[PDB]
A paper describes a structure:
The C-terminal RdRp (residues 273–900) adopts the canonical right hand polymerase fold, consisting of fingers, palm, and thumb subdomains.
The [name] construct used to solve the crystal structure ([name]-Δ6) contained a six-residue deletion (795WSIHAH800) in this priming loop, which was rationally designed to eliminate the need for this movement. Although no SAM or S-adenosyl-L-homocysteine (SAH, a byproduct of the methyltransferase reaction) were added during purification or crystallization, SAH is clearly visible in the electron density in the active site.
Numbering used by the authors: 7 to 404, 420 to 453, 478 to 794, 801 to 900
Write the structure that this text describes.
């Protein structure tokens, strides 16, 4: 009797209760909550039809199987494997086959990225199908059964059927019952003939002993099978082991054309940079032929060491205080950020590795026209200038702070600067410093002189602040016209065309020859051409790939916020023209459109249209003259700026209430104080704020560093989200647990980064320095500081009314004392009497006994 047979007997003895717990015991699975809800509501993009997609992902990213050419998916079912293979590089065609009908899953039509090459066919029994020419053979067919003898026959029948399909090509077939003796005989027979290796997938549940025969690998079958049996028999002991949860795969959307997909880069610009990297790492420099890069130019690779973590460090301070939110899924999801080399490749493929189609000649014309009009308007007063070393140093001080004191660092800059003056680049490489200074030296004037301030840009909101954004949107709502629209763009930086960059290049026309020659270098050598390093796992280890592309946008740049704000202002303007009827479908296709009607529209109506918008980076809020703006989608899509989570040809939905308008990941409320005065406060789903608070940027932070981080978020809540009952209570709880004298430190210098009394700060922010507050009468206590409506608060994710929150908020005194005990004998202060409940529980309970 084999080892596998002993496992089956134990599996059958388990009750239905014991079976369900052991099934997902210690395994790995993906969060299908958002996916299943989406498919239920009829969402056709970004989603995977089943868990098979991520199940097949585990093999590909480890190079166990590399799907090439025609891909045949025997037993596609829902089509989990097919839609995933569609988004792969070396795949040219995907064909699916499933029996379907009653009792069997039917193929689910999707519009994910690469759907156009996917061909799913129902009513196909693979056992009666003659083999076809394919460079990749996939099979996930196998039905489990309590009797191992039954699984034995079902496994062998599949093996005999998938055999003629394998002709020195990539493959990945599912083996239902690998532990049966007669099955192994066939496996060993097929191993000597087609090679490969049998591998167990961690995403497979413990209820099945299924293993997958991959093409790329080697090893002993008999040993590997028994190791799986020993594992499943070992997991019988420990059952309550929580399954490792991972993020599901984003299959994106849109059609895929393999012919016009690859990248044709320029070399004489970036070649010097590549050469220096190659010579530095000439020890292990090589060219990986199986690179997954599609729309990016692959140059080479070299061996490195692993960098990054699968999970993020949890701020223990706030976690001990936000106990009721330990059961909330949304809060947990925000700490599941994967930064491992495996994750870097997963993130790259799903969002970074895409190509935006070249805009129509007519559209390219209007974009150029509006750009020159916009730059001339932005520079009506301010003149472009060169930033200084003194400015750079001052902002750095307010390691990295030690690198500026090193004189050798500044001389390296000069050597790189003179190259830029010669139209050459050598050391400017982006990662997933000296280059950043050179950009600041040229384009830093946009932020320092505040080019995108509302006083100068009419639409921009740079330097205003979060607490003033709400008042801005309220003023916009007063402007007559249609509803307020606010569409978010899916991956803005990945949708910047080459035409968009050339329009941003026109700013150099207002610069001095010595400034212009340096600025054009930054645009041409660092923006319109760039080299990025990115980690990638290989069967030999971790390597660093060198890629390049001549468009899109670098996330970590100096002019990231600026240029995105500029182009977005341009993008929304064109859409209004389409809405008003200025630009027609013919005009966008016409390479020679009359600029008379466009210029006249900009010279006359152009100013007011800018006053109807509030734009910050990719986020934008537009209140057009009418609701024709909603159906204006021809130009917005042709520019490559496709909206997120919505069909490309579906009219946008606007709001006539400014309180429901989303902007900068926030909505705003207008509440009424006890004195009758009105305030406009920022707001967002409560699970997000707590989710951000329970994470800690970086790892290996001491208790003090985590406590100082906690106090920062705490005072942030007390200043911005005071209107929330749960957050204000948590804020005072943290401040009570965190030592008073300890200075809050984190990656900021906002208005909550001080040691002053927050009450006095609140009066300075919302009363003193508030231009929308005519009555400067100060507020003497937090009890006069208004909350949201209980109905309003609960809808925003509050937990008020629940037993868990009720138990917490009243037993908060214990958790605070617990934190204080861990810190030690230091000086604290009770922030709980700041609110009414504990103040009445101190004037009563205190005076009684
Ligand atoms: N004889 C047969 N011929 C073709 N398909 C069959 C078959 N017997 C079963 N199937 C199909 O095989 C599929 C196995 S489940 C497929 C899951 C797939 N990998 C995904 O990720 O969606 C079932 O959907 C079943 O309908
Ligand atoms: Zn350079
Ligand atoms: Zn709200």
């Amino acid at each position: 009797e084999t080892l596998g047979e002993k496992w089956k007997k134990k599996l059958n003895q388990l009750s239905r209760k014991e079976f369900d717990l052991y099934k997902k015991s210690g395994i790995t699975e993906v969060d299908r909550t958002e996916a299943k809800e989406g498919l239920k509501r009829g969402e056709i993009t970004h989603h995977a039809v089943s868990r098979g997609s991520a199940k097949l992902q585990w093999f590909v990213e480890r190079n166990m199987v590399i799907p090439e050419g025609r891909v045949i998916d025997l037993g596609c079912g829902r089509g989990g494997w097919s839609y995933y293979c569609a988004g792969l590089k070396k795949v040219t065609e995907v064909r699916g086959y499933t029996k379907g009908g009653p009792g069997h899953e039917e193929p689910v039509p999707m519009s994910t990225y690469g759907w156009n090459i996917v061909k799913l066919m129902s009513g196909k029994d693979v056992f009666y199908l003659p083999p076809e020419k394919c460079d990749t053979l996939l099979c996930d067919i196998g039905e489990s059964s309590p009797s191992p003898t039954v699984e034995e026959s079902r496994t062998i029948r599949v093996l005999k059927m998938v055999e003629p399909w394998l002709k020195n090509n990539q493959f990945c077939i599912k083996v239902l019952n690998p532990y049966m003796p007669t099955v192994i005989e066939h496996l060993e027979r097929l191993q000597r003939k087609h090679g490969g290796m049998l591998v167990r997938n961690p995403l497979s549940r413990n209820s099945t002993h299924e293993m997958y025969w991959i093409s790329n690998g080697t090893g002993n079958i008999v040993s590997s099978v028994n190791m799986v049996s020993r594992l499943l028999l070992n997991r019988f002991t420990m059952t309550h082991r929580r399954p490792t949860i991972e993020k599901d795969v984003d299959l994106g959307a849109g059609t895929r054309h393999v012919n016009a997909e690859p990248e044709t880069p320029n070399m004489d610009v970036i070649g010097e940079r590549i050469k220096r990297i190659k010579e530095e790492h000439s020890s292990t420099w090589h060219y990986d032929d199986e690179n997954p890069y599609k729309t990016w130019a692959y140059h080479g690779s070299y061996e490195v060491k692993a960098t990054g973590s699968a999970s993020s460090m949890i701020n223990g301070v706030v976690k001990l205080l936000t106990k009721p939110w330990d059961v909330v899924p949304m809060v947990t999801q925000m700490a599941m950020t994967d930064t491992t080399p495996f994750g870097q490749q997963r993130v790259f493929k799903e969002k970074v590795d895409t190509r935006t189609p070249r805009p129509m000649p007519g559209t390219r014309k209007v974009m150029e026209i509006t750009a020159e009009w916009l730059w001339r308007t932005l520079g009506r007063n301010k003149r472009p200038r060169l930033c200084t070393r003194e400015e750079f140093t001052k902002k750095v001080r307010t390691s990295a702070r030690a690198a500026v004191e090193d004189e050798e660092f500044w001389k390296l800059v000069d050597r790189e600067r003179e190259l830029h003056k010669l139209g050459k680049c050598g050391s400017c490489v982006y990662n997933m410093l000296g280059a950043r200074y050179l950009e600041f030296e040229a384009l830093g004037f946009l932020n320092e002189d505040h080019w995108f301030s509302r006083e100068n840009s009419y639409s921009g909101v740079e330097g205003e602040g979060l607490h003033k954004l709400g008042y801005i949107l309220r003023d916009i709502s007063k402007i007559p016209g249609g509803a307020m629209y606010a569409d978010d763009t899916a991956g803005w930086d990945t949708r910047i065309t080459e035409d968009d960059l050339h329009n941003e290049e026109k700013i150099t026309q207002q610069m001095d020859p010595e400034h212009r020659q340096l600025a054009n270098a930054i645009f041409k050598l660092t923006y319109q051409n760039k080299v990025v390093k990115v980690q990638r796992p290989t069967p030999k280890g971790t390597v660093m790939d060198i890629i390049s592309r001549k468009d899109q946008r670098g996330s970590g740049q100096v002019g990231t916020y600026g240029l995105n704000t500029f182009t977005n202002m341009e993008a929304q303007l064109i859409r209004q023209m389409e809405g008003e009827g200025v630009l027609s479908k013919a005009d966008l296709e016409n390479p020679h459109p009359l600029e008379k009607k466009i210029t006249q529209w900009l010279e006359t109506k152009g100013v007011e249209r800018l006053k109807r918008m509030a734009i910050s980076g990719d986020d934008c809020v537009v209140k057009p003259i009418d609701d024709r703006f909603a159906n204006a989608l021809l130009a917005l899509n042709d520019m490559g700026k496709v909206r997120k989570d919505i069909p490309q040809w579906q009219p946008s939905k606007g709001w006539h209430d400014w309180q429901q308008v989303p902007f900068c990941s926030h909505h705003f409320h207008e509440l009424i104080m006890k004195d009758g005065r009105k305030l406009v406060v920022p707001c967002r789903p409560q699970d997000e704020l707590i989710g951000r608070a329970r994470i800690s940027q970086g790892a290996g932070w001491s208790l003090r560093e985590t406590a100082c981080l906690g106090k920062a978020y705490a005072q942030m809540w007390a200043l911005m989200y005071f209107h929330r009952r749960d957050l204000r209570l948590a804020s005072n709880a943290i401040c009570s647990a965190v030592p008073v004298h300890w200075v809050p430190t984190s990656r900021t210098t906002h208005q909550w980064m001080t040691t002053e009394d927050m009450l006095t700060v609140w009066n300075r922010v919302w009363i003193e320095d508030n231009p929308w507050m005519e009555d400067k009468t100060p507020v003497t206590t937090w009890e006069d500081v208004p909350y949201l409506g209980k109905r309003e608060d609960q809808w925003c994710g509050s937990l008020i009314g629940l037993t868990s929150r009720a138990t917490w908020a009243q037993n908060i005194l214990t958790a605070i004392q617990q934190v204080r005990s861990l810190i030690g004998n230091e000086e604290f202060l009770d922030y709980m009497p700041s609110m009414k409940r504990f103040r009445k529980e101190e004037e009563s309970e205190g005076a009684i006994w």
